[PDB]
Structure formats: structure tokens, C-alpha cells
Design a protein around this ligand. Structure first.
Ligand code: HEC
Ligand code: HEC
Ligand code: HEC
Ligand SMILES: [Cu+2]
Ligand SMILES: [Cu+2]
Ligand SMILES: [Cu+2]
Lengths: 455, 455, 455
């Protein structure tokens, strides 16, 4: 058979698995081994977005699952354990396995049990693994996917950094950024209408202070999976080009491309060389996914500028929106305080500050000053202070026509922003009221609910 | 011109067309010929799923249409006939034809008529053909697509088996598995929301006793089309790898890939080598299509196990669900009996048995025993017998919280299964009631309709 | 760095930009230059379809934006100006730029202002540029995308024609062909449900008298972009094959393919050789886009027939529908007349004539004669004249069963055509009434609204 280098030699190796976005070290090995893999399924609530909880089903406690790294020709003894707290049974299908179900039948595992099967890794490449338990779509949509790398016998070329990034589409009963513990929504899933499309299982998993890092000059390899369940990723890097893209274990390698399609359940290895400092955005270039549903990740490059290659500034909230900042933890706090019944004005102000970036500042500015005659000010705005209910209606329904603000005429259009949730509108408005010599006070989510319901 | 090998020589050849999943034999020919192709359009009702009828519009009585096999450089005389029973006019656009419409204008054919045009096959490759009659989307969605192979002059490499598989997306007024003659739904089609996504024009067309077959060691070529009309297939083989994938007549060939995107109206040739016995699943790896809408087909490999490559078991209902069995003909029977007004308890029991596999057995087991403390039993269940209306509500709406069943406490979650149709719920429950020393009786679809309608 | 050929030499060059579907001439240059690009954003209403207006946001007054053509190694000084009449701020992200945001942060530009940044063009290839201003999806969906070509240092191979074609998906509050100024619809956009999918920013932008042109024998290069924001194009040429397809600046080139996937925000260069005369259709082969939402463009080839390659006729309304004609300007006129309150019978007749092609003529014929016993006549139809309200209901709801028309029995099915708008139905019926010795008179959109509303 291809990839057959004999029986395993040396000692049995207990595989070291890593959580995203990190990868285990190169196998660095000239002989085939028996590799023992132990993976445990855990079902648990985590934050899919700030103040938004979801019950994930995970291989190893993360979405995506633990990264597994072996060598072509290895004999893999795969142990799957299903944690006693689990409610569902689970199993695994690994792409790149040669045999029925990729492991599915022999890895079937009830809560509190363990299963094992053995396989030879005949096929070199980067491969998706996922759960394979009826209803399969439900399991994958709850986060049951990861990557396994089968290295070529001589290993991969050395690089300065290796990272692990995995897209997934998610289906919540609530709309995007609607707070609370969100159930899985089977209707949306059957219709291929995700509420969130994410890298590494949460909004902002790889933005701000959780960005990936490298330096000018260094090479970076990214192992990129698409767990689906349903979407095909127009996978793209903003501001750069991939030196190489290779799908699965495929013999073809594409070079110098910026945009590449990754099928549902597909995987690729991309190589990137850092040339100038700043933030490079990994996105699904089906744009509403990247900018309205959470499908963005940051590779942040540090080092000397090169004005002869690029004279411009680092990314900011104009493009990246509220993810230009280090985090939006103020939103989490304000949500937790709402639940507990201890929500203060300052909680709301801090949450609104986080949310105002991009969403409002793109026209009104970060300091609320506007641009005279073009964008009216929110700083010390007579128009705002004059009527706070009207301000709620402007955010929800937009505004057009001639207005006067601080003694100057505006005649333009503010688009409606109806997708904002009640709490986001309330927090943003509360931030504005308490900034820039505005009169203070607060707007509550419940005030916004009433205005939204009014015909 | 390219692919020009002179005028046709020898005798005129009447092309031998085959129905899916089979392919005509290699042309096996060193000279260009005049090839006469006769294809007849037939409009007819067939089963798109068990007890679910659809009026298909077909090239040659099948979906996909008859496979056409010629040699590059051949002069093809194409005859299209539209059966007198047809209500619509039809025509053909063949990909790989050099000329306006791929044949569309000259092949326009009213019911009871015949058309012909001639073309030279300049372009080697595997190509989609489809109907090209306004409204074009309606025709293609009713099943009017197939494949034509233009062999290279020396022919393709010899293999042990050649098969013909074609994906399509379908748009019914009813939901998935909703019984009866289902009309075409233009709204769903415009929205790209298929109710079914199928290989070879029906659920289970290529599963169970209709699987494709080969033996360990043999090579298999599959001609894979995507008729659409709308979907792009993340085409994938579970448990194996494609040695080669080649799109259309393209010069590039990809090797050792498991997952490949096939555009709407695209076609590929995949090669597969059987290495270990068992069932290999062809799927659209946009998962809800493969596991909720019918997009799965089986290549079943027979021969000696090889425990050094793979130690595990054959696929079963955990992964494949109700398609692990040879067929679900009991469902067809129970549906026909409902229509006729002769539905017996045993009809329902047999239909429910077919439907219980995967759908319920994944947690409750095939024998209904459950797993003590984890999954409650349906076998001899006091809880079930205690209240059959409640059992209907559990299937539709799920169940959580503490319960007692046969003197043991359970505290878990059964997800709702609201996508099940009234008859499926009724048949499944009737099967359960009449198995495992349960008290018998029956649930009717109409009982389930009332429970579903209750607020 | 790669693509570094030294500092700019010679004189500064002011880049010549072209509107679609044309391309600037080859740079024809052996040395790196400083190239100055000046692009102005204009927001304006244009016809997205006949009698249907949309407020586009454009780079240079067109959708797609002005084509930019430079050489690898050039130093580009990019000036973006935002026209004083603009309501929104805008910026640019150019694919192929090496640096954060592809230009986004430094090109941020308020109405009435100008920005500039400089970059070196290190990466050869065809690249999308688009606006990058929060909310990014809204800007791109309003038409803010184009192509930039970075030529290899030796330039591209000479061809006879070079054209510029760009797909986009659009989201209107109204349905397809619903008349009036249509607002942008954020809900449809988030859901990836376009109302229109177009080449070059309008239905018929490249059909009829606006087709692209070449002659038998000539080679044609097309620069093909997919601006999205959301859709992946199954990009296909009907009746031909691409000699070459190359994505972005990629080293891989595919040859002899007819169907190719272009990611959202991707771009390709296709080469085509004209072999026989007639109309070749560029489509997104997700069929409902091409035939129900406007995703078709025509390359019309003139020259001698070659009956040995293809014996058939030129494309007509059977396949192309109402776009087989030179234009549908009568529809624009009738819509303008409705708005002004001067709509005459002849306005309606001419608009209905344009709309009847394909939509009705495929079965009833262009002369309304039908086919005796198979398709009943609309020419001098007693059945039509007998009841005009019934005729309205037939178009909206279809017709089946036995009928008699001009003394002959028909027993067939006319499908419903409910997606037709009130004005289209009214105009079509008014055309029929006033043709072929029918009794004349007229149907108004308001008559059709009442019939449509009746239960
Ligand atoms: C894309 C531009 C844009 C965005 C984004 C935007 N605005 Fe505005 N906003 C405007 C314009 C323009 C007006 C004035 C409209 C007119 O002339 O009729 C306006 C008016 C207003 C007003 C009333 C006038 C004033 O200055 O007091 C308020 C309050 C306001 N915006 C708040 C917000 C808030 C809060 C956000 C975000 C949640 C936001 N806007 C987002 C452009 C924008
Ligand atoms: C994924 C797991 C799973 C699937 C699939 C599933 N069940 Fe259950 N089912 C359970 C669990 C767990 C409970 C107990 C819930 C609790 O503890 O509150 C349950 C409870 C029930 C009960 C009530 C308790 C009993 O044992 O009598 C019935 C009846 C039942 N299921 C029938 C079905 C039927 C019929 C199907 C399929 C149509 C099905 N279930 C599918 C997990 C499942
Ligand atoms: C795909 C076929 C097809 C298309 C498209 C179609 N028709 Fe028909 N039409 C028919 C058939 C068949 C009947 C007769 C149905 C029957 O036998 O019950 C019919 C019947 C009618 C009738 C009533 C009988 C008569 O001859 O007067 C009218 C009026 C009519 N069509 C108008 C139209 C108009 C207007 C259009 C387009 C807007 C249209 N049809 C599109 C096939 C078609
Ligand atoms: Cu699972
Ligand atoms: Cu047809
Ligand atoms: Cu813009």
C-alpha cells in the first residue's frame, strides 16, 4: 500500500495534543511508531459572544478540537472517551483514515465510557475530524470538529510559527448578539442560515489581545479547517498574499493567491511571510459573514515599517469595527450585571463605549464631534438632549431630511440599525448621554423594547 | 482546430446509452466516426423518497439522463425526441459543444416531435448536458440533466468498474419526507432552499441493496456530475481518498484528495482504489444536505479485512441512520395502504421499524434497552405505557428533567424531533408499542396532527 | 522582496482608468514607474433593471469601478476623493497591496475630501478592490468594487480583445423587477438572499446591443471579478470552453475548462478563442441566478459559419428569454409613463411585447399561434376574449384540465407565473389583447393587484 513503511518501531508514543490556536511540535522522527491518542468529549456552556452563552459539544474542551499530529506510516491507537457529564453519545470520523466511517462504528461511546480502534496513517496531509453520531449535523454544529496532521515522512519545511484556525457556522434560536444561553436551532441549520460564522468557536477568539503574533521577516504556517457544517469559506487574508496553499494531502499546491475556497469539511495549509508590520485579517470573504456574523481573525505583525512598500496606517475601527480594541469584556460584565439585577450606569457606559467603536464612530467620530455640516455631533448635542426617545428611534429606524444640531444644518441620511439588540442600543445611548458634557441619565433595554414595538 | 482528426470514417455508429449508475463501454476506436445519438424526453411521476412522488422531466426516463459516450473528433448527429405524453417543450444544451447554446436553438422540440443538429466533439472531457427551455431553472430542477463523456483519442486508462453519479437539488411544496405527490415549488427554488439534495434522483438511489459494488484491490472510476440547479457540492468520500480528480476536460489533475468542490453544472472524474472492505459513503459534505436531505451514496467494497490498516467495524445506523438497511420499502407500503384506506397495525409496525434505525436507536438502542441511568428503555417501558399522548409530545418537543422509568432515575435531555412528519411519528410509536412486551395498540397520523397543533 | 525592481524611473505616470466593460491599454513598459491613480467615489441612482432604480455607491461612477492597470514593481500613489454630494464616508481596500487593510485606514475619506496613500505593487495578478467602511457589507452591496491588474514585468500575451466583467449580488426591499426606487435591504443581505445577481451592475448590462464583440478566429481575454458581497459564482460560458483560467496572481493555470468557481472577492483572467459565430453566454451556473435574477452576459461572435463544427442556429428567446432582443427600453418607457400619469395603451403594448418573448412565446409562439392540440393559441383566441379577468388568473395561478380554444380541445398544464409583477402581467396581457385580431382594450396593474389579492 502507499505510505507503508513497515511495522511500528521504537517505543509507543503518547500523542501530545494542543488546544487552538496552537499546534503540537513537529514529530521529528525517521521511523514509524505506534502513536496512542486519547481524546475526551466534553459538553459545556461557553461564551460564543460577549454575554451570549452556548452549549458546545467539544473534542477536548475546545472548538475546534485538540490538534492531533502524527507521521505518515504510523499506527494510531485511537481512544475516545465521553465524559460522564455528557448527555449524548459521541464518536469520531477522521478524514485521512482508510476504512468505513473513518472510525465511526468502533468509536461509538456512551457518556462515561471509552472506545478504541486502531488505524494505519497511509495518507499524508491535513484532515478534518468530526463527530459522526445521528443526527450528525447537530453534533457538528455544536462544535465537534478538529484537525489531524499526517506529516510526510521527512516532515514539513521549518517555519517560525505554526497556528491552528478553524471556521464553523453556528445556529442559535436568538439572533446575532442576542444575549443569554442560546439553544441550537435545527430550522436555521437545515436552511443553512447561520446566526454566527466564527473562527475557533467564538466572536473575537482571535482578535485584539488574542490575535496571533509574528514579526516582520518571519514565516507563518496556518492549518486552516472548515468544520461547517454547511458553509464553504471564501478564505482570504486582508493586506497580504499566501505564498502557498495546499489542500488536504493533495499533490497540487497553489502559490501567490490571496483568496481560496475551502469546502465544508475541507482543510488547507497556508504559508505566509511577514513583510510589513500591522494587523492582517483572516476572513470568510462572503462579506456579511466576516463583518456581521463574526468570521474574522487577526495575525498581528510587529517590526520596522517600510514606507517604500506601504506608507499607510495600521487597521482601526473604520474597517474592523468594535474588534479593533483589545477586547469587549465590558459587554460581558454589563450582561452579567443585568442578569444579577445590579446593572449600574457605569456598567452600561463601559459596554456602550466598546460597542460605539465602528458602529457609530465611523460617521460621528470616536470623540463624537462629527464633521461640521456633514455628520452632526453627538458631543454636547442639543438635538440628542432635546429628546432621548427620538434618539432611540433614530438608532432603530435611521434618520433623514433637514435637521439642525448645535446651530448648524444637516441634510443627509443615517441608515437604520435595526439589527442592534435592545441592550446594545440602550448601552450605546447610555454611553453617549454620559460623555462629552451630555446630560447623563440612562436608557434601559426595556425602554428600547417599547420604542421598537411601537408602530 | 484542436481535436480535429479529419472527416468521419468507417460506418455510422448508433450510440449505446446507459441508465445510471452504469456507463457505456469504452469506445475502443482509433478513428473518428459519425455517432448518432437518440435521446427521448419523458415526463413522469416517480418516487423521490418512500411514499413521496414527484413529476420528473427526464432525458431517457431517468434522473440523471442517459449517459452518452463518444470520442474526441467524432461528428455527433444528435436527435432529441419529446414523448407525445409530454406537456412541455424541451431542448438540450450540451457542455463541451462548440456553438451557440450548446445545441439549444436547433434542438427545440414540442411534445410528439423530433429535432436534430450535428456537432463535432472538439473538446475532450466529462461534461454536463441539461435542458435549456425557458423557464430553464424549472426544467433543470425537474431532473433534466446528465453527462456526456468525450474520450481522449487513445481512451481512458483501464479500470475495474466505471459508475455514473449525479447530484441534484430539488424543490417540493411539502417538507422533506412529507408524503404524496409533491409539486415543484418555484419560491424555494428562487431562494436556493432545497427540500431534497440527492444522488441519482431519489433518496436511497445508491444505498442499501442499490449500493455500487467493487472488491478489495480493484480500481473504480466515477463520473460525478452536479446538475444543480443551484448548489455547489462539497463532494467527499467518507473513509477513503481519491487517487485522482479531474474536472471537465481540464489539463490539471489533483491527486490524493478526499474533499472537492464541484460547481453547479460542473462534472469530474474521480478514481478510487479499494484497500479494505466495507461501505464508503459519497456525500455532499455540507452536512445537513447529506444527513437531512438525502445526499448520500454507498460504494460497498467486499474482500478480506486488513487489521493492520483498519481494525474497526463496518458502518451501521449510528452514522448512516435509516439508510444502513437494505431498503425502507415498508415505508412505501404503509404510505400506499394509508392512501387506499387499508392501513393495518402491522403495516405501521414495519414502517416504524425501518424509521426507528438511527433516528431513535442511537440512544435507545436497536432492542430498545437503553443504557441504565443514561438512556431510558423503550423496551417494556412503564413510562411509555403510562401515557401515549405524552410519548407523542416527547418525540415532537423533546424531554428534559428528572424522570423515572422502570424504577430508575434519568436526568438528561432528549432533543425535539419536530422535523419528523405526522405519519413517521405515528409509525415509529406504533412500532414501539408493538415491540418488546409493550402494550400494543397504535398511533395514527391524525393523533399526531392534533398533538402537534395543541399550543 | 519579490517583485522589487528598484526605485521608480522615468516620469510620473497619471494612470488612465476605464469604465466597464473596457480595459486600459497594456502598460508596455520595461521599467518601474511612479503611477498616480485618482479615483472618485460617487453615490447615485441608476437603473438596476428597466423601470427599477437603485442608489449605487460607485468608484468612478460605474459598477464595477474603474479598472486600474499597473506593472509589478510600480510605486502607486493612490488618491481617493469622495464627491461632495456623497452622504457616506468611504475608503478602499485593494487586494494585492502589501499592508494592513490593503489601504483602508489611510484612504478614509469624508464627503468633499481627498485622501492618499502610497504602495509598491509587489504582487503580480488580477485583484479585487472594494470599499472598507463599516458597515462594510452595505458598501460592497451598493456596488463598491472593481478590479486592479498588476501586470508581470514582461506584460501579458497579446490578444485581440480585452474586456472587464464583474459579478455582484444585490439586495432590494422589493422583489425582482418590482418597479420604483428600491432601497437596500439589510435583512436579505445578512441572509445571503439576493434579489438580483448581475454582471456590471444592471440587468442586460452586457446583453443585446450591449453585448461584447469579437470575430471568428480572434482571441479574447476577460478579466472576471466577483465583488459579492456574498455569493460564489459557478462562472460558465455557454457554447464554448476557456483555453485558460488563472486566479489572482496564482502560479497554477487551468486549461480547457468550461465551468469554474470564483470566490466572493476573487478574480480570474479567462482566455477564449472564437471558433464559430453566434452568441456565447457568460453565466453564474447556479441557474436561478442566471435565468431568474439577471446573471447573464453575451459575447457575440461574427464571421463565417462552420457546419462541420456546428450545424445549429444562433441563440434565441427559448433559452435567453426576453434578453434575446436588442433591449427592453419599452419597459423603461412604460414605467416612466406610469409614474407621470400618461400611460397609453401603446406604451403598454410595446412593454408587453418586450416581456412576452421567452416568458410566454416559448409555448404560445412569437406569433401567438400555439401548436394545435398541444399549446392553445393566443392569436384570435375566443377563450381569451371570452373572459379577461380569467386570463389574469391564468397568468398568476396557471391553468390545467380540459379546455376548448378556437374549437379545439387542449388538456395540459400551464404553470403559474406568480413571480411576474402586476405591471408585467398587465402589460403582457395588454400586448396580447392588441395583437393578432384580438379585441383590444387594456389591463391595468391595479386590475392585476385586485385579482392577485382575491382569495
Ligand atoms: C453612516 C453614517 C452614520 C452612522 C454609522 C451612524 N450615524 Fe448617526 N447620524 C448620521 C447622520 C448623517 C445623521 C444626520 C441625518 C440627517 O441629516 O437627517 C445622524 C444623526 C444622528 C443623531 C441625531 C442628530 C445628532 O447629532 O444628535 C443621533 C442621536 C445619532 N445619529 C446617533 C447615532 C448612533 C448612536 C449611532 C450608532 C449606533 C449612529 N448614529 C450611527 C450618520 C451616521
Ligand atoms: C440523542 C438521544 C435520543 C434520541 C435520538 C431519542 N431519544 Fe428518546 N430519550 C432520550 C433521553 C435522554 C430520554 C430521557 C430524558 C430525560 O431524562 O428527561 C428520552 C426519553 C424518551 C421517552 C420517555 C422515557 C421512556 O424511556 O419511555 C420516550 C418515549 C422516548 N425517548 C422515545 C424516543 C423515540 C421514539 C425516539 C425517536 C423517534 C427517541 N426517543 C429519540 C434520548 C434520546
Ligand atoms: C410552458 C408552457 C406555457 C407558458 C410558458 C405559458 N403558457 Fe399559457 N398556456 C399553456 C397551456 C398548455 C395552456 C392550456 C392549458 C390547459 O390545457 O388546461 C395555456 C393556456 C393559456 C391561456 C388560456 C387559453 C388560451 O389559449 O387563450 C392563456 C390566456 C395563456 N395561456 C396565456 C399565457 C401568457 C400570457 C403567458 C405568459 C405570460 C403564458 N400563457 C405562458 C402553456 C404555457
Ligand atoms: Cu457527537
Ligand atoms: Cu425541458
Ligand atoms: Cu464605501
Amino acid at each position: 500500500l502507499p505510505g507503508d513503511f513497515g511495522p511500528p518501531r521504537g517505543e509507543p508514543i503518547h500523542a501530545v495534543l494542543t488546544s487552538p490556536p496552537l499546534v503540537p511540535p513537529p514529530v521529528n522522527r525517521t521511523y514509524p511508531a505506534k502513536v496512542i491518542v486519547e481524546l475526551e468529549v466534553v459538553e459545556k456552556e461557553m461564551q460564543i459572544s460577549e454575554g451570549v452563552s452556548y452549549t458546545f459539544w467539544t473534542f477536548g474542551g475546545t472548538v475546534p478540537g485538540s490538534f492531533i499530529r502524527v507521521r505518515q506510516g504510523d499506527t494510531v491507537e485511537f481512544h475516545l472517551k465521553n465524559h460522564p457529564s455528557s448527555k449524548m453519545p459521541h464518536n469520531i470520523d477522521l478524514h485521512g483514515v482508510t476504512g468505513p466511517g473513518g472510525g465511526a462504528a468502533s468509536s461509538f461511546t456512551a457518556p462515561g465510557h471509552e472506545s478504541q480502534f486502531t488505524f494505519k496513517a497511509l495518507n499524508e496531509g491535513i484532515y478534518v475530524y468530526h463527530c459522526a453520531t445521528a443526527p450528525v449535523g447537530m453534533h457538528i454544529a455544536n462544535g465537534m470538529y478538529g484537525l489531524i496532521l499526517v506529516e510526510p515522512p521527512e516532515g514539513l519545511p521549518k517555519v517560525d510559527h505554526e497556528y491552528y484556525v478553524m471556521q464553523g457556522d453556528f445556529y442559535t434560536a436568538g439572533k446575532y448578539r442576542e444575549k443569554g444561553l442560546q439553544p441550537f436551532d435545527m430550522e436555521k441549520a437545515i436552511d443553512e442560515r447561520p446566526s454566527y460564522v466564527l473562527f475557533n468557536g467564538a466572536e473575537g477568539a482571535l482578535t485584539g489581545d488574542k490575535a496571533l503574533h509574528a514579526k516582520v521577516g518571519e514565516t507563518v504556517r496556518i492549518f486552516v479547517g472548515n468544520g461547517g457544517p454547511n458553509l464553504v469559506s471564501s478564505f482570504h487574508v486582508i493586506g497580504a498574499i499566501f505564498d502557498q496553499v495546499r489542500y488536504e494531502g493533495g499533490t497540487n499546491v497553489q502559490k501567490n493567491v490571496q483568496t481560496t475556497l475551502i469546502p465544508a469539511g475541507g482543510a488547507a495549509v497556508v504559508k505566509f511571510t511577514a513583510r510589513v508590520p500591522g494587523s492582517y485579517v483572516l476572513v470568510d470573504h462572503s462579506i456579511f459573514r466576516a463583518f456581521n456574523k463574526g468570521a474574522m481573525a487577526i495575525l498581528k505583525i510587529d517590526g520596522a515599517e517600510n514606507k517604500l512598500v506601504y506608507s499607510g496606517k495600521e487597521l482601526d475601527s473604520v474597517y474592523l469595527g468594535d474588534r479593533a480594541a483589545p477586547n469587549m469584556s465590558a459587554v460581558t460584565k454589563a450582561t452579567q450585571a443585568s442578569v444579577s439585577g445590579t446593572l449600574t450606569v457605569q456598567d452600561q457606559v463601559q459596554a456602550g463605549r466598546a460597542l460605539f467603536a465602528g458602529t457609530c464612530s465611523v460617521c460621528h467620530q470616536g470623540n463624537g464631534a462629527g464633521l461640521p455640516g456633514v455628520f452632526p455631533p453627538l458631543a454636547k448635542s442639543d438635538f440628542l438632549a432635546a429628546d432621548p426617545k427620538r434618539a432611540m428611534n433614530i438608532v432603530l429606524h435611521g434618520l433623514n431630511g433637514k435637521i439642525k444640531v448645535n446651530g448648524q444644518e444637516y441634510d443627509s441620511v443615517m441608515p437604520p440599525m435595526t439589527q442592534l439588540n435592545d441592550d446594545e442600543v440602550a448601552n450605546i445611548l447610555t454611553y453617549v448621554l454620559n460623555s462629552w458634557d451630555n446630560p447623563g441619565g440612562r436608557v434601559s433595554a426595556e425602554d428600547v423594547k417599547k420604542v421598537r414595538a411601537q408602530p
